Design a protein around this ligand. Structure first.
Ligand SMILES: O=c1cc(-c2ccccc2)oc2cc(O)c(O)c(O)c12
Ligand SMILES: O=c1cc(-c2ccccc2)oc2cc(O)c(O)c(O)c12
Lengths: 306, 305
């Protein structure tokens, strides 16, 4: 019983966090095998934040301009290369603590854990969601760039996020591990703003199922709804439109609780209309949307508190 | 910028979790030096659960009844022992990944990270606070017993909790690592109910400072309050009494933000007897009380381990 915003155990990522310095700029790097990945704006100086030509900045660098530090050991760079907005430093030494891993790109609504790091050393870990506007609501101070987001499935670390910048509204944008940004963002200090954010509908429904699994159903009602009539209502509360694919993904959870997806959609419609009237759901007075259907099945029991 | 429920990195504890099997029952153990710590109720059977005699139950078993598994390697038990409600299994191997550590007993209102485990394998990590009624609101299924809660200070893990049981309302009860129970519960299948809980006042104010530090200031006001006057208000809403020492502990947060403590107390007062008036604070519709003052200073200055 209980339900928590639960990150993955971060030990396998802790062993890969290094420190990258170029001139007077220091950030975090990801050491896997004999390569260190870090954001390419590590090569920018104070007069390079607005309109940097990274190709022109990189060609002015030798291998010995990049100081890489793994704890106390100094890894010697023997090669460097740029791929989109991530820099790849070939080092002397394969990281002995390298886990099994893969680089993946995720879609909005999907979740991942963040190991917030500073100077190559970890500060904390927490759960995150790629918002529909391709930002994340993380906890990032200056120097955290290079901190990675990840999921762990059967001792394989699927790396999905690398932090690059802080937006003027306080949310955060970054790339996948091949250097391609999430959203229309770029590694320039010029004025950027994210699109209008939106609530992750399929996640709210999965969360409602998790509340039923844990033994609460005061919010259900006797109604059902059509998918289109639900989407017409939900979008007036700034919810993402719910697709048939999402409906199919809530299949397992609909089968565990015996509540049909469009029946849970009907309950959500009433919750948006009424609020909670001084009640809570899984210890929250808002509608949580940063648990995916796979997250809920992972953390929740296989038997409902019926 | 941004503020999140941030757990400690779990890698140091990850290398200490093993599987403990006694006959039918399988739970988790903590492998440190050459000892394995785990709840003593791993010794009970379905029959014993109602009025067990742990001393007699334990006398009747030897070292080979205890199956300890560290991943793929099996650790031999060379001795078994009981210290309060935890079982100590002496093993043939000192854990090589044993970190610098100590056993610490915490206070209600204090926070820690929980490494939820199943069959000796870590599955997740999250922040807890110990409730003033000595329960914690964790996320545990069956098989999670033996999972530990910990804090970190510059390379030193401080173990403060071991999970033992779920109470009927779904909250959880456990012990420190010396086997002493937090709160008035026993490792017996019987009728046990958590006391009436209350809200950790000093933690709510620390979280309001965190909201100010993050440039979210709409709840402040121009009033004052004495300590007493605020305490008379807080007790109606079932808030823990805020002592002088709590006001002292909020000093550094007061200094950084420019908001005097009792001015923030005045701001919490109006927030209680009137509500949020539709707005939120740090993306939350509730007044969060699971951040200590130290948590707020650690997250907003980025202390590392
Ligand atoms: O938002 C950031 C933007 C840039 C940046 C640097 C050069 C050119 C363009 C953008 O560098 C950063 C470095 C950090 O360590 C950090 O925490 C950050 O949030 C940023
Ligand atoms: O609540 C629990 C109670 C008991 C227990 C122990 C001895 C006598 C009677 C009951 O064992 C457990 C074992 C677990 O693995 C677990 O997750 C649990 O929640 C419990």
């Amino acid at each position: 019983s209980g339900f928590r915003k639960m990150a993955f155990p971060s030990g396998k990522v802790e062993g890969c966090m290094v420190q990258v310095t170029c001139g007077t700029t220091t950030l975090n790097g990801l050491w896997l095998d004999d390569v260190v990945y870090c954001p390419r704006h590590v090569i920018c100086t104070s007069e390079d934040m607005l309109n940097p030509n990274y190709e022109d900045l990189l060609i002015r660098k030798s291998n010995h301009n990049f100081l890489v530090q793994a704890g106390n050991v100094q890894l010697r760079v023997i090669g460097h290369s740029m791929q989109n907005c991530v820099l790849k430093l070939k080092v002397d030494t394969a990281n002995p603590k390298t886990p099994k891993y893969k680089f993946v790109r995720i879609q909005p609504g999907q979740t991942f854990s963040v190991l917030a790091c500073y100077n190559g050393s970890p500060s904390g870990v927490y759960q995150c969601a790629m918002r529909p506007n391709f930002t994340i609501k993380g906890s990032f101070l200056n120097g955290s760039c290079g901190s990675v987001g990840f999921n762990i499935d059967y001792d394989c670390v699927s790396f999905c996020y690398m932090h690059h910048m802080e937006l003027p509204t306080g949310v955060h944008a970054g790339t996948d591990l091949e250097g391609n940004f999430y959203g229309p963002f770029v590694d320039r200090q010029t004025a950027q703003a994210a699109g209008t954010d939106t609530t992750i509908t399929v996640n709210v429904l999965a969360w409602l199922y998790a509340a039923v699994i844990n033994g609460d159903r005061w919010f259900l009602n006797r109604f059902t709804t059509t998918l289109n009539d639900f989407n017409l209502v939900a979008m007036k509360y700034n919810y993402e439109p719910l697709t048939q694919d999402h409906v199919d993904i809530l299949g397992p959870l609909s089968a565990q609780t015996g509540i049909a997806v469009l029946d849970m959609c009907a309950s959500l419609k009433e919750l948006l209309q009424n609020g909670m009237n001084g009640r809570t759901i899984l210890g929250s007075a808002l509608l949580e949307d940063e648990f995916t259907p796979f997250d809920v099945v992972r953390q929740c029991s296989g038997v409902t508190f019926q």
